[model samples]
Target chain A: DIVLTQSPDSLAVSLGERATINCKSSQSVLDSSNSKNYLAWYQQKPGQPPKLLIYWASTRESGVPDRFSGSGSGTDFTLTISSLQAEDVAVYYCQQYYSHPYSFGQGTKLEIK
Target chain B: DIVLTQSPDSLAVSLGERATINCKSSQSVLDSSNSKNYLAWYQQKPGQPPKLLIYWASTRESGVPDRFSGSGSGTDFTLTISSLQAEDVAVYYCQQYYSHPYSFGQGTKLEIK
Candidate 1:
């Protein structure tokens, strides 16, 4: 199974500051055929299931705030929120679909300081 | 912009008893040819990201217990735990994968009664 390890288990950032969460996959998620990355990111608030924010590495979901962006390829990927807001204070995760039995990261809790 | 509907926000079952979660999508995601409409099921315990139990509606992930099964054709999806276990207490979710900006069910908490 492909394991995605998220770093900084927890993060506390000030409002208006950029908040970043990194995830490293045990195997490469990049594809050679279409030159695409199967990495995806999600946000989960209290009582709500995780929601997709970005996919295909850098393809931001429609209506997803511009601040939320995905970067990196292959085994390295990151989800970034340019300016953190109160609503952004929640657990974030990274997922991969490059292979069967997709896997997710441990999760990073973003707190407002 | 498709939305998913899940029933019984929470359910309880005794150990070794069967448990099921139901999910419905607003519209059909059927695409002729290959790659059936992607609806995946996940299990998420507290303080952890979700684990893929099934993908493509009925395909169980590799290494997932045989007791955990997925079924449903068209727009209705169902996840069933053939026999509950102590370690199965957690939240379950069904997600729309074929659709862009993938959406997930609010989640159904599974508890041992």
Candidate 2:
């Protein structure tokens, strides 16, 4: 089974500050075909369901905030929050869907500074 | 697009008792071969990343607790906790992996009664 490890179990950033979260997979999530990585990122706030932010590695999911962007590929990935807002206080997760059973990183919590 | 509905948004069960969560997809997620359902279940504890439990409708992930189980096919699926544990307190979610842009259920919160 592939394992996903995320850095900084928790983070503290103020409004207007940028937050960066990193996720590393034990195995590659890159798909040779379609030129798309089989990775996705999600945001989960307290007491609320997780919302999709990005898919295919760096492609933003429909309706995701412009401030939330994804990058990286293969075994490494990152979720960056530009000009973070208080509303962005939540946990972010990186998931790999290229294999039969998908797995998610432990998560990184972004909090107001 | 498919919608996944989970019943009993929340459940309270005593330790040593069994608890069940249901997930119904708007459409069949079974492949033409009909051998397996491309569904999976996850458990998310407070302030932690979601843990993968079951996949392929009923296959358990390696090292997962034996008490956790999954079943069903097509559009309906079930996740059963054979014997609840104190550490089982978390939100459980079901997701379909049969197609692109995978969708997940709103989630069922499990609490220790």
Candidate 3:
């Protein structure tokens, strides 16, 4: 099974500042056909279940704020909040679905400064 | 987007007792080609990231105990624990991977009696 690792378990960013979370997979998640990375990002608020943010590595989920973006391929990926908001304070996780036993990152907790 | 709902928001069982959690998806998650349910189960403990327990509906991930089993097809699914243990207390979520914007169930909380 491929393992996923996330950096900066927690981070604090002032409102209107950028918040970046990084994720790395033990192996590449890019598929051969279509050349799409089978990675996804999720946000979980305190006391609530997680919500999908992005998939295909960078495609933002419908209704998700434009400020949230994803980038990267293969074994590395990143989720970026262009301008952090009070409501954006939550935990972020990255998951790879390229193979069975889909794995997830440890998660990064974002806090408003 | 598919909506996953879990029944009995929470449940409490005594040690060595059986614990069952039900999950339903808004749409069928059975893939025609593979004839398999594109669903998965996750377990999350307080202050920790979610762990993959079952995938492809009924297939358990490596290292997962056989006592923890998943069953069902189409839009309905079930996760059952043959014998409850102290360490089994956590929130269980069902997620459908059949389509984009994959959604997860509200979650079921399991407690030890």
Candidate 4:
């Protein structure tokens, strides 16, 4: 099984400030044939299910604010919130869909300062 | 994105009793070429990241307990816990990987009575 580790576990940023979370997978998740990273980002609030924010490493999901962006490829990835908002106070996770039994990062808890 | 709906937003089950959670997708998630359902089930405990329990619809992850099983296909699916346990109190989510913007159900909260 591939392991996905996220950094800092938790982070706090002042409202309107940038917040970044990093995720590293044990193996590369890039699909050579498609030249697309099989990565996705999700946001989860206190009492709700996780919401997909980005896929294919950087493609923002429909309705997802432009402030939320995903980058990097292969084994390293990043989810950056250009301007943190109160509503963005939640846990963020990076998942890999390149293989069966898809795995997710440990998750990073983001809090508004 | 395919919308997912879960029945009985919350449910309580006595110890050793059966617990069932239902999930419905707005469209079929079965891949005709692979003859596999692209749906998965996850368990999220309080203060912890969600864990993959079942993928490909009914295949349990290597370390998952035997009591936890998944079934059904296409647009309808179910996650059943043969015997509920105190440690089983948590939220369950269903996700679809059949298409882009992989979506998840609203989630079902399970409680031990």
Candidate 5:
């Protein structure tokens, strides 16, 4: 099993400040294909199901705010919210899909400072 | 991005009984060439990380019990527990991976009667 480790289980940032979450995989999330790494980011708000934010490492899902961006690949990845919004207060998670039994990180809870 | 809709937000079943959860996608998940759907099901216990149960629609993950099974194709899918055990209490979520920004179902919560 490929383990995904996330740092700073919880974080607080000013409403207009930048907030970043990091995810590291025990193994490379890069698939054998030429496509981008099989990594994705999701946001789960309180009492609500998770919503897709980014996939293939850096492509933001449609309708997602431009403030959210994903970067890095293989073992190191980052989910950055350039300008945090009140609506962005939620738990963010990183998931790998390069192989079966796709697993997710423990999750990073983001809140307003 | 595809949307997956799950039914019966919550259900209570007796031990040894069977419980079925469903996930319906807005688009076909099956890959004609590979003959694969890249679909998977996961179980999330309260205050714990979600565990992969079935992958590629029907392939069971390592260490998963035989009681848990998945069967479906195209836009519809099912996750059925042959005989619900006391430990089966948790929320089940289905995800599709045929495309980028893979999406997940809202999830179904299962509980013992």
Candidate 6:
């Protein structure tokens, strides 16, 4: 089974600064046929359901701000906020959906510095 | 994108009692040709990333206890716990993977009565 692990249980970044969160999967989720990773990123605000940020690693979801980006391959992936915003302060997670059974990372909490 | 609504935002069930959570999607998630529902159920405990419990509607994910089951199709769905347990105290969410955004429910919190 694939297990996802995230770095920095919590992070504090100054406003307008670039903030980054990292995720590592126990197994590679890259599929050669399409040359795309099956990884996805999500953001969850307090007391709200998680909102999809990016899928296929880098494709931002509709209505998701352009400031958010994602990149990585094989067993590693990263979610980057080009410039932090108060609304971006939340818990971020990485998920792999290729497996019949989906798995999510422990999560990384972003906070205003 | 579709919206998911869950009933009984919170619930308190006695130990060994059955628990049920309901979810309704804005549109049909059933694939008629395949006769399959493309919805999923997840469990999230305090501070932990959500875990997939069931997918394709009624199919339980590998290693997920049989006591936890899913039912319904198209626009309405349900997640049921045959017998509640302390370990099961958490928020349960329903999500649709039939389309982009893979929208999720607001979630239902379950507690021991």
TM-scores, all models, native as reference = 0.95, 0.81, 0.92, 0.88, 0.88, 0.97
What fraction of the true interface does each of the listed models get right, in terms of native contacts kept?
Answer: 0.91, 0.41, 0.56, 0.56, 0.41, 0.79
For candidate 5, list the clashing residue pairs, or say none: none
Error of 2 at B94 (Å): 1.3
Candidate 4 or 5, higher lDDT? 4
The lDDT values for all models are 0.89, 0.87, 0.92, 0.91, 0.88, 0.93
* Residue A25, candidate 3: alpha-carbon lDDT: 95
Q: Candidate 2, residues A1-113: lDDT per residue as tens digits?
A: 67789998998987898899999999888877777788889898777667778988898876678999999988998889999888899889988878856788888878897
Winner by TM-score = 6
Instruction: Report the number of the highest-lDDT candidate.
Output: 6
Stretches > 4 Å off in candidate 1: none
Candidate 5 colliding pairs, count: 0
lDDT of 1 by residue, B7-53 (tens): 88999899999999999988765566784868888899888888989
Q: Write the per-residue lDDT of candidate 5 for residues A1-113, one digit (tens) a residue.
A: 78899888999999999999999999998876785798988898755666779988998987788999999988999999999889899889898878766788999999999
Question: For residues A33-60, what per-residue lDDT tens digits would candidate 6 score against the true structure?
Answer: 9899999999998888888899999999
* Regions more than 4 Å wrong, model 6: none
| DockQ values, each candidate | 0.82, 0.40, 0.59, 0.55, 0.47, 0.75
lDDT of 6 at B24: 97
Q: Candidate 3: deviation at residue A18, Å?
A: 1.3
- For B6-89, candidate 6 gives per-residue lDDT tens digits of 998999999999999999999999999999999999999889999999999999998898899999999999999998888999
Candidate 5 Cα misplacement greater than 4 A, ranges: A31-35, B99-101
TM-score of chain A of each: 0.97, 0.95, 0.97, 0.97, 0.96, 0.97
Query: How much lDDT does candidate 1 score?
Result: 0.89
- Cα lDDT, model 4, residue A65: 94
The fraction of reference A/B contacts recovered in model 2 reads 0.41
Candidate 2 Cα misplacement greater than 4 A, ranges: A14-17, A26-38, A97-102, B33-35
